[PDB]
Amino acid sequence: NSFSGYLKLTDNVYIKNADIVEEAKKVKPTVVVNAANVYLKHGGGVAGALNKATNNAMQVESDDYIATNGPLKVGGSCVLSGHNLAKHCLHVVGPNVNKGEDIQLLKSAYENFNQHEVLLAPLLSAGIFGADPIHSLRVCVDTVRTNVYLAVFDKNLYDKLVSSFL
Numbered sequence: 001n002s003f004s005g006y007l008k009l010t011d012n013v014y015i016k017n018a019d020i021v022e023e024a025k026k027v028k029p030t031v032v033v034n035a036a037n038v039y040l041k042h043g044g045g046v047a048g049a050l051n052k053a054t055n056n057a058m059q060v061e062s063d064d065y066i067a068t069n070g071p072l073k074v075g076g077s078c079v080l081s082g083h084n085l086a087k088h089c090l091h092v093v094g095p096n097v098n099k100g101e102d103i104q105l106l107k108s109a110y111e112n113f114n115q116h117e118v119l120l121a122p123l124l125s126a127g128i129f130g131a132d133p134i135h136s137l138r139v140c141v142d143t144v145r146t147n148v149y150l151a152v153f154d155k156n157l158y159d160k161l162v163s164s165f166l
């Protein structure tokens with residue numbers, strides 16, 4: 001595939017220091033994962049950045065999704081358009097530790113990735129969602145069996161995730 005410059009961590013998990021938005025614009029993957037919340041309100045972090053790059057089209061589509069279907073579950077997901085960034089966007093809700101949500105649901109969140117052969121993804125529940133990114137990477141490695149290309153925007157964190165991995 002056309003993912004470039006990734007470091008191989010396991011048989012199926014790869015990692016790169018990059019903004020997921022810029023990777024999506026460059027690669028146009030079949031699936032980009034969004035770090036969504038249950039209301040699909042894409043205000044900040046990964047979700048706000050992805051939505052901004054779609055000129056708010058992701059938000060407009062999401063609002064119709066919620067009006068029809070209601071909120072997602074924590075640990076759940078839905079497939080929507082990838083707009084100008086990807087064929088599809090897999091919106092996945094990891095638990096928000098700042099809100100006291102069950103960190104065990106992080107494994108359930110990552111299980112959604114197994115429905116897709118290849119994905120470009122962020123670390124779920126980390127960033128503004130409040131969980132430890134080192135833990136999120138471990139759950140990813142131990143849960144996802146399909147091919148996952150992880151983009152991590154923060155360089156200091158990227159270096160810590162790699163250095164502490166084996």
Ligand SMILES: CC(C)[C@H](CO)Nc1ncnc2[nH]ccc12
Nearest residue numbers: 019020046126127151152153154
């Ligand atoms: C999720 C968190 C560990 C990570 C820390 O850099 N955030 C992100 N990773 C990749 N692309 C991004 N775009 C906007 C934020 C962001």
Ligand SMILES: [Cl-]
Nearest residue numbers: 045046127128
């Ligand atoms: Cl974030």
